[PDB]
Design a protein around this ligand. Structure first.
Ligand SMILES: Nc1ncnc2c1ncn2[C@@H]1O[C@H](COP(=O)(O)OP(=O)(O)OP(=O)(O)O)[C@@H](O)[C@H]1O
Ligand SMILES: Nc1ncnc2c1ncn2[C@@H]1O[C@H](COP(=O)(O)OP(=O)(O)OP(=O)(O)O)[C@@H](O)[C@H]1O
Ligand SMILES: Nc1ncnc2c1ncn2[C@@H]1O[C@H](COP(=O)(O)OP(=O)(O)OP(=O)(O)O)[C@@H](O)[C@H]1O
Lengths: 345, 348, 343
């Protein structure tokens, strides 16, 4: 039987992980892509440095057309080559907006990013704070730092938001996905989540729960691994960022697996690409909510958060008379909330 | 009574200099700017590093909307954000023209600039030469620097034009404006002018008094502090430079004040901003004449000279769905001519 | 007169508003006259340049004597503030056994082994103590260490992974008393305990110090003890790059303000002898052992924080050039906080 859900593709990739990684830079699951378009045939996306004809390729590097795993499940094999706009919304999010909400710029003493969303703690005092990344919100040298908006007191005027309380660095793949997606013993998944509660003296009347440029949003869309592939992969999503305004894109790959220079395996949740030849995100967009758009009038639903700028890692080069495109990685929102024990307002 | 002259604005700025200086990057006087459009309400413009809502500013950090001066004069406050064209005219001014005049390129041993205008010495033996900025006209090590056009012989073919006779860099505010512009003694306005006379063997038949791309010009328009603000602020000007060609802009503020790292106050006379989101000038345009646009068919008249490119200092970022716009600083022509004792030439 | 370090600390804290205007740092100890240590207790003040009093306005002229809330008075000392050998080769990885001062290389940086220790509670695992700057990389909280080089850079063996570490501690908890009018007061602990791997061979670990010998128990620093017990005492250290070196303790409870206004505290200040540098780069984490007196076994007193070549040097004004200084963290308080006992 052909693969239908993400779990089958993940199992197939894990079973033949060695062969896929033997002559490749990365692996993921999704739909087969032909001539730059997304089809409806489930398959495994294999990233290579360059694309060449089979004539100049030895049989060792000739990847099999079909990969078959336990239980009779089989899938196709796809080899893919791998290598501040001034607007009213951007100005408002940069310090021109009276209220504070999603997409607002949050600057630390050293780095800056985009405000993720307003959340509340499930247990304890149930303090209301905001959720963001961990590479910008908190510097590793100082575990507990402060938050300033728009800028700290040394760079310019600003107000104090709060201090970092709970943050996550890495999580074992078993805890995150619930299944073993890799044979290497030290498999990790990046969360890059942190919660900063609002200060006691901070006014709460200036906090808004409406996302600028999108409008009202629904409940968090939990990505169930048993759901059909077409449910999540290929759906058009939108994002709001301080330096990128409002952007739209489409998701192509999920659970991208790669290895660093030290051989440690790492996983990325969501892989998306901007639409109409436009880059999905830019520098300073760390902390932008990826939201699945409205369908049949239903309220848009956040599904994840952008990890950060991918321009420093690589680009997706298309082989159909087109230049390389910019891909953006993502981090799951439901699993991050579950780990952080937070509820989105 | 609402102030309507530059003198009142200068008095208000000087009387409350400390308050503005405490949390400002610069001060000027002119017309209030709302949503990127100049208004008719006179106000003192205060320049800040960034613009934020008043809710995230301390009570001492909030500049008052209005201020009062001696005798009952009151004025508003406007906070403003602060942070080679290949053409036939440019080619001709580069050294391919049949005559040398305003806008021509003058190159020293090290740097280059644009000829200001042909002038005549009021006193002495009625020497005839030209006016330009002091920075490029004279080398800091050689008080008497030679002039070449279009390039010095060490860098390319050219002819000798003359030698620097007199130059001025800084002058006390009392002598320049006639009034005390601040509560600082060590206050000096930057004239940055030099008079370079033509060589005895140089041919005067090749000197023309007609500005290329504009036409004939009239007498220098002296700026009076008692005149209405609308006379100078908000008017349209045009300039010709050897690098940017012909460029049109608008005057936005007067008597800009700046503080250096050492704490020495400095003053700039004319503040210009380009039109249609186009830079007023670029590097190498220093010394280009600023000419007020003709009105009701009147002959255009120069109002000042251009100090140089501002790209090495900063830009003002408009907060209306647009990016930073380049601005230019200039020095009053009439006061510089009076100090240097020079007379402009407008006819052959 | 101030006889204990606590009196000097209280005096400095009470008047910590006039010495911070025109000073780069403050500490306590003995007044220095003509380049030599005196016996008069005083508070050391660090200035960029030691100009003459005549060319100094009265506002910038600091008082020479201060009085505390209990009648204690102390003077003011103003000091201007700005190898290939067999032992080194053996310590670099040529020794059959590991021990104090041994080179330990991580995936990014390398450092010196502080001392072999054990945990008081729990499994009481046996490991070693070092600095977090080298042993711990925060973009990889659990890092691996190899001696003398990591596999990617050369031959080596697996030692273990960092389990517990401390970077900053509140001043009240560390010293026990409020040392500053500032609440964002922090003290740089910089101590990480790495336990030996289960498969690691424990027969190759020695508690003897190369170039020094056997050492006794850790000598805890008591703020109530006379300054002579700690200030002006000779100390020695063994570093991977600097071999065996000796120096003298100069200052205690040094305070420094960063560019962001956050104050930080360093415990021990040491200076090399004979105009020789106390330590070089890569010697961070080396133990500081008090010189043996009257035949008593040497007792370590702290751990070197790191090289000061990137932080400045002590400039003297007696026909001599600047002398490099070294910063250290008290061993007793760090061990108490981290619950570790030196074997
Ligand atoms: N290791 C490799 N190095 C270089 N080129 C390779 C390597 N492995 C495969 N290729 C080339 O990449 C091709 C992958 O084809 P794939 O199945 O991904 O695409 P397709 O659906 O046939 O069409 P399209 O080219 O439009 O994507 C292989 O046929 C071979 O030409
Ligand atoms: N020191 C300061 N730093 C930053 N922002 C400031 C400072 N002082 C005032 N502001 C902000 O700048 C605003 C000044 O507005 P301005 O004087 O330009 O009036 P306006 O013409 O009504 O405004 P606009 O140009 O936005 O149409 C103040 O209302 C406050 O929001
Ligand atoms: N803020 C300052 N900046 C520069 N120099 C200063 C400052 N305050 C004091 N001084 C100078 O430093 C001297 C401090 O001398 P100090 O306290 O070390 O006495 P001393 O031990 O007798 O002197 P010495 O070390 O020269 O033998 C003051 O007498 C004055 O000359």
């Amino acid at each position: 039987q052909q693969a239908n859900s993400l779990l089958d593709l993940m199992t197939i990739r894990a079973f033949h992980s060695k062969i896929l990684r033997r002559f490749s830079l990365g692996t993921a699951v999704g739909f087969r892509i032909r001539k730059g378009d997304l089809t409806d045939i489930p398959a495994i996306l294999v990233f290579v440095a360059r694309k060449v004809h089979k004539k100049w390729l030895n049989p060792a590097q000739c990847l099999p057309a079909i990969l078959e795993g336990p239980g009779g499940v089989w899938c196709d094999v796809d080899v893919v080559e791998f290598s501040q706009m001034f607007s009213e919304l951007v100005d408002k999010l940069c310090g021109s907006d009276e209220c504070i909400g999603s997409g607002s710029q949050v600057a630390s003493h050293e780095t800056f990013g985009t405000l993720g969303a307003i959340v509340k703690r499930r247990t304890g005092n149930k303090q209301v704070g905001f959720l963001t990344n961990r590479h910008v919100a908190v510097d590793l040298d100082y575990p507990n730092q402060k938050m300033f908006h728009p800028l700290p007191p040394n760079l310019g005027p600003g107000v104090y938001l709060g201090a970092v309380e709970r943050a996550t660095s890495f999580i074992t793949d078993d805890v995150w996905y619930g299944i073993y997606a890799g044979t290497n013993p030290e498999t990790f998944v990046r969360a890059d989540g942190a919660f900063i509660p609002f200060a006691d003296d901070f006014d709460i009347s200036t906090v808004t729960t409406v996302v600028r440029g999108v409008g009202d949003i629904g409940d968090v869309k939990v990505i169930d691994l048993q759901c059909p592939l077409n449910s999540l992969i290929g759906r058009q999503v939108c994002k709001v960022g301080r330096s990128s305004g409002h952007t739209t894109g489409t998701v192509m790959a999920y659970a991208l697996e790669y290895n660093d220079e030290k051989g440690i395996c790492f996983f990325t949740d969501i892989l998306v690409v901007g639409e109409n030849r436009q880059t999905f995100d830019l520098e300073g967009d760390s902390g932008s909510l990826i939201i699945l758009t409205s369908q049949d009038g239903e309220k848009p639903r956040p599904i994840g958060i952008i990890w950060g700028g991918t321009a420093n890692r690589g680009r997706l080069k298309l082989t159909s008379d087109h230049g390389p495109e910019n891909w953006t990685s993502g981090v799951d929102l439901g699993r991050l909330l579950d780990r952080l024990e937070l509820d989105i307002i």
